[model samples]
Target: QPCYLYVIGMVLTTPLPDELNFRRRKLYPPEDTTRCFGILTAKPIPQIPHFPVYTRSGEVTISIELAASGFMLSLQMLELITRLHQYIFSHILRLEKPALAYCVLPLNVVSSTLDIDFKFMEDIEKSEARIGIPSTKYTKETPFVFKLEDYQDAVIIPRYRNFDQPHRFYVADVYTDLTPLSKFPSPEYETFAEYYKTKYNLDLTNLNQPLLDVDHTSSRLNLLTPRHLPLSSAEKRKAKWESLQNKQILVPELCAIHPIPASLWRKAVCLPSILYRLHC
Candidate 1:
């Protein structure tokens, strides 16, 4: 018999501009301290190490996104997670998006869900309510604030109509910890928890909202499954796409045999009747 479990994977992030200022560790002052992972700015902003370079291999970026005008870091955090999932399915995971330029990346959504669970870190009464960077690697003493882990044991890649519930579906078994954050910044990580403690006088832990019960199962998890049809035609199309992608990723060197031809630009508007006769 298999039992379900919700495991926590702690992801550590590299230092961004805003957190450094909050901790007073940044050496040279940034022209705009408010610019960060979409938290301070409403539009897309520069990621710390940059998005394309790191995501070339498809590593998840975890940070919160805020719509500006608001200083709610936790809500931004949730947005980041939601955005990460969206970005992966759209780009790297599926490899369907033609280019990253067209992709709209997801950002963190900081919200009440985190406020209630992990409020211990933001006790500003002891300090100015800032997150400390962990100098150690994966050790309890030093840890990053946010990490991405598989919530369900099986993620429904293709949905099936739910027998027990109406208007619901299920899919493939969820693989646990597909995007594990095995590393973190060495001794310097502060996230929504640290930021919120200072911004608000009240403690989030004391709130009455339900904690995400790791042990309990819920119907809400099904909502994450995407709506899909498994028709025979769809399956054939899927197979064809897989074949094409496999060729691109695996045997891309075949391009040497068919280099770009200058004649490709010329339009073959018409063919002589004699040329067509050769086919007969």
Candidate 2:
């Protein structure tokens, strides 16, 4: 017998560009801030140790480390997770459109207990030994740090029902940590559609809402089941009819609309092509 247990997992303050100037460390100046993740920015980003770092292999190594602490562990599983993290960590560059980036730092550094001066010295020493020159001496400082608490830990992938359009619908499991409610007030379908419509001047009407499946494995825990927009009575009944037929089951109510002529046995009208036309 499984018992019912519930668990829950950010602050989105409108950034004051005037009041809040993004800064680097004492060694690195404000003017030297380099390319970050999205349009959003943060400070004291983690220093990348070595240049020409192989991102994919490094990401997969990080993936293994992440899984050792009780996360999904598999090739396919890591592919998506690593892909998202890698995109945030390595791919989003100075030239990217979103102009947004995030950073990852050790726990001690973020908690403000670590000795930054010592760490800086260690990094310079290692860089001098490796490349015959101190790396941070010439390069712009990386200024993106991951606020672990702030991350929703959700995968938001775009889906496309259109033939021409590349990406349209947002798809995740029934229980992915999506729909940033604090930032946007509305159902996901409405908010998501409106976002694209406003930003890109694109209209998306037919978003595919996920169906319920008890046995399905999800990447993230679903916080709440959102209420669906109500369908008409006829629409509900027709949906029920289609559902039952898919499972090779016959519903008694649908017989009224789908008649069986000259038959003792109540035969199911399996001809959905014909029945759908008649019902409409």
The Cα local distance difference test for each model comes to: 0.22, 0.22
Q: Per the 3 Å backbone cut-off, how many clashing residue pairs does candidate 2 have? A: 10
Task: List TM-scores for all candidates, in order.
Answer: 0.16, 0.15
Alpha-carbon runs more than 4 Å astray in model 1: 1-66, 69-91, 94-104, 112-280
**Which residue runs does candidate 2 get wrong by more than 4 Å?**
1-90, 94-111, 114-155, 159-280
User: Model 2 Cα RMSD, Å?
Assistant: 28.7
Tens digits of per-residue lDDT for model 1, 142-258: 322221222222111101112232120111122232212212223342432333334443223222111111110111111112122456988689657644432211010001111
lDDT of 2 by residue, 1-280 (tens): 1111110000112222332321210111111221111111122223222111111011100110110111223455334333433332232111132211221211112243221122332342243222121112211243222222221211111221222322111111132333212123345534544555565554432233222111101111111121126799998896676444232211111111101011100011111111122223
Model 1 clashing-pair count: 34
